[PDB]
Each structure stands twice: as structure tokens, then as C-alpha cells.
């Protein structure tokens, strides 16, 4: 079996992408953020504190004939940005673009941090990292992808994110019309529970490619590209007037400047991120200072290949026994 769903940017900056997901019987449609950097499927619900809900669509398990409380199970998650959520667990039927899983753990939020409350367009997250990161206690739960794996024609999912445009998430098949050339596959390490891989180097604009190993994770739930301070200083040194601002919390550049491209290595192949994808607009409305898409990973502890990098390629997440990541130009 296969699944295919459209993913849409939440705003004009591609801050996040939402995909419609059907939960329960009769179906309740929620717009979820597909996250390859986490492993929990959690939603805003009829149990969430009324003051912490601001325009989101909520899941109501009492209105679903297939919903069952997972007695005693609780979950608690904290993200890299400082945001958090916790609550109880239900099992229910979940479908993504025609692909149905029965008995999926659906984590019902009782408490959510202000970061989630502010985003009225996001009804929850659908975790696609390895099930070892799931926060359900005492019984750890499987992700939607892990539960669907047996039914799928191939144990894969693909991410095809658009630049200021909708894209696609496919499950169980590789669309050979969505990319040009061939797909380069690279080894994944599952030791930390992420889609962790090693990039073979980088280039700034039309400069020479520097061969160097950059270990990082493929994360659809992170907006920006976070790389080591050395690489990031070499990129921003090419932008006139660019500087790191402590007040802003990262590199900023004059909105009048043209940004060079950034190339990252995948084995012997090159993926080129156009300069426009690195522009995240004014820091405040009317400002002449613009926020950059390539930032330092020094304060994080891990290099992250987020949406800025992923939307420049057709990306294959191969969940076979020996997992691999595939990259192709598009």
C-alpha cells in the first residue's frame, strides 16, 4: 500500500509546513507539522487547558468510535527551542493521504507551552524520527512510519518541500518524475535516534569546494540550516555588511544585499541551495536588517540540516534494516 499527501507552508517565509491528517472514526482532520527530528504524534485536544488554545482545531476522542484510552500511559516532551507539551495517550485510527494505520498512539495534549499556542495554523506534530525517541511511559510507542512499514510497498517515505509553494510527502514509493539525474544514497547512524548522516563538504557561491566531514541530522521540523561556526563565518564573510547580533540571536544582513548560494556534499554529489532560500526577511516590519537562513550550531550541540537545506532537494528516507538517506536535485 501507499500514501501521498500535500504539505503547505504556514506563511510567506516557509517557517513550517502543515499536512492534513485524518484521526478517528468518523474522521477528524487536523493540520500536523511532519517532524523527522522527533518521534511523538501529539495533538491539541478537548483535554488541553482552554487558555492554551488559540484558534487550533482540536481532536475529540469522545466523538470517535475507534478511540481507546491507553490506561496509565503519559508523555512529556521538550524541544531544542525550549518549547514543551505533555498529557495522556489514546489509540486510534490515523490516515495520511489514503494510508491507514489502526491502533496508532495519539498523544493528547493537556498542557502546551506559549510557542505552540501562538501558532494557530499548527494542530500538532507527527514524529518521523526512530521510535527509540518516543516519550510515552511506561510503554514506549511506535511512530506512524514504523506502524505502517509492514503494509507499505517499500519501507520508505519521501520529502519534497516547496520554496514558497506546496510540496509532497509520499509513503511507500519513490516518484521518479519528481527529480532530475540520479539519487545519491548515504549511510545513516541511528545511535541517537535521529536520521544522522555525514556531509562530505561545502562551497560558498562560485568558490572552491572544501572537502570536510560535517555530521548532522535531516530535520523537516527545523526551519533553518545550523552548521559549525567555521562554515557559517565563511558564508557570511561574503555578504557585505553581514554581522552576528546578540540582540537578534544570530546573523543578520542588509536587506539590500544579494546572497550567494551554498553547496553541501552528499557523497560525490553536490546539492546547491540558491541564495534566495537563505533570505528570511526583515527582523521586524519596516526594518532594513534581514535575518539569515544559515546560523551557527555552537549553542545547540548538533548540526541540523533543516527546511532551508531539504527544500533544495528530493529527499528519500529509507527505513530498510540498514537505513539510508537519498538526495537528488529537483
Residues 56 and 180 in one domain: no
Residues 225 and 209 in one domain: yes
Residues 34 and 57 in one domain: yes
Q: Measured between alpha carbons, how far is 20 from 305 in angstroms, rounded to an integer?
A: 24
Q: Among residues 235, 218, 239, which one has the least CA distance to residue 296?
A: 235
Q: Among residues 292, 294, 290, 286, which one has the least CA distance to residue 254?
A: 290
Domain final position from 127, 142, 174 = 174
> Active-site positions?
35, 199
Strand (E) positions, 2-83?
Answer: 3-9, 17-23, 28-35, 41-44, 68-78
Q: How many CB atoms lie within 10 A of CB 210?
A: 15
Q: What are phi and psi of 29, to 5 degrees?
A: -95, 125
Given a contact cutoff of 8 angstroms between Cβ atoms, the answer to whether 128 and 144 are in contact is yes
What's the chain's Rg over C-alpha atoms? 20
Which experiment gave this structure? X-ray
The count of structural domains within the chain is 2
Helix boundaries (H) for 78-193 = 114-118, 144-148
Residues 66 and 53 in one domain: yes
Residues 209 and 330 in one domain: yes
Given a contact cutoff of 8 angstroms between Cβ atoms, the answer to whether 38 and 129 are in contact is yes
Q: Decide: residue 177, CB within 10 A, 0-12 exposed, 13-18 middle, 19+ buried.
A: exposed
Residues 160 and 180 in one domain: no
Residues 10 and 87 in one domain: yes
Provide the domain limits for residue 290. Answer: 175-330
Question: Resolution to 1 decimal, in Å?
Answer: 1.9
Q: Decide: residue 26, CB within 10 A, 0-12 exposed, 13-18 middle, 19+ buried.
A: exposed
Q: Measured between alpha carbons, how far is 294 from 280 in angstroms, rounded to an integer?
A: 10
Amino acid at each position: 500500500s501507499t500514501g501521498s499527501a500535500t504539505t503547505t507552508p504556514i506563511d510567506s517565509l516557509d517557517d513550517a509546513y502543515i499536512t492534513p491528517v485524518q484521526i478517528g472514526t468518523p474522521a477528524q482532520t487536523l493540520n500536523l507539522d511532519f517532524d523527522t527530528g522527533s518521534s511523538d504524534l501529539w495533538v491539541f485536544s478537548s483535554e488541553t487547558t482552554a487558555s492554551e488554545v488559540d484558534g487550533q482545531t482540536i481532536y475529540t476522542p469522545s466523538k470517535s468510535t475507534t478511540a481507546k484510552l491507553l490506561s496509565g500511559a503519559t508523555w512529556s516532551i521538550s524541544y531544542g527551542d525550549g518549547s514543551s507539551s505533555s498529557g495522556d495517550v489514546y489509540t486510534d485510527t490515523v490516515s495520511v493521504g489514503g494510508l491507514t494505520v489502526t491502533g496508532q498512539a495519539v498523544e493528547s495534549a493537556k498542557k502546551v507551552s506559549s510557542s505552540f499556542t501562538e501558532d494557530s495554523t499548527i494542530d500538532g506534530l507527527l514524529g518521523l524520527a526512530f521510535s527509540t525517541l518516543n516519550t510515552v511511559s511506561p510503554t514506549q510507542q511506535k511512530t506512524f512510519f514504523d506502524n505502517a512499514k509492514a503494509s507499505l510497498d517499500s519501507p520508505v517515505f519521501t520529502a519534497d518541500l516547496g520554496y514558497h509553494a506546496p510540496g509532497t510527502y509520499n509513503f511507500g514509493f519513490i516518484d521518479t518524475t519528481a527529480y532530475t539525474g540520479s539519487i545519491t544514497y548515504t549511510a545513516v547512524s541511528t545511535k541517537q535516534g535521529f536520521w544522522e548522516w555525514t556531509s562530505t563538504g561545502y562551497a560558498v557561491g562560485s568558490g572552491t569546494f572544501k572537502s570536510t566531514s560535517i555530521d548532522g541530522i535531516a530535520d523537516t521540523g527545523t526551519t533553518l540550516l545550523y552548521l559549525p561556526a567555521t562554515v557559517v563565518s565563511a558564508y557570511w564573510a561574503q555578504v557585505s555588511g553581514a554581522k552576528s547580533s546578540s540582540s537578534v540571536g544570530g546573523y543578520v544582513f542588509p536587506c539590500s544585499a544579494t546572497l550567494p548560494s551554498f553547496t553541501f556534499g552528499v557523497g560525490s554529489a553536490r546539492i546547491v541551495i540558491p541564495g534566495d532560500y537563505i533570505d528570511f526577511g526583515p527582523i521586524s516590519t519596516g526594518s532594513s536588517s534581514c535575518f539569515g537562513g544559515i546560523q551557527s550550531s555552537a549553542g545547540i550541540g548538533i548540526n541540523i540540516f533543516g527546511d532551508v537545506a531539504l527544500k533544495a532537494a528530493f529527499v528519500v528516507f529509507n527505513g530498510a534494516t540498514t537505513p539510508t538517506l537519498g538526495f537528488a536535485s529537483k
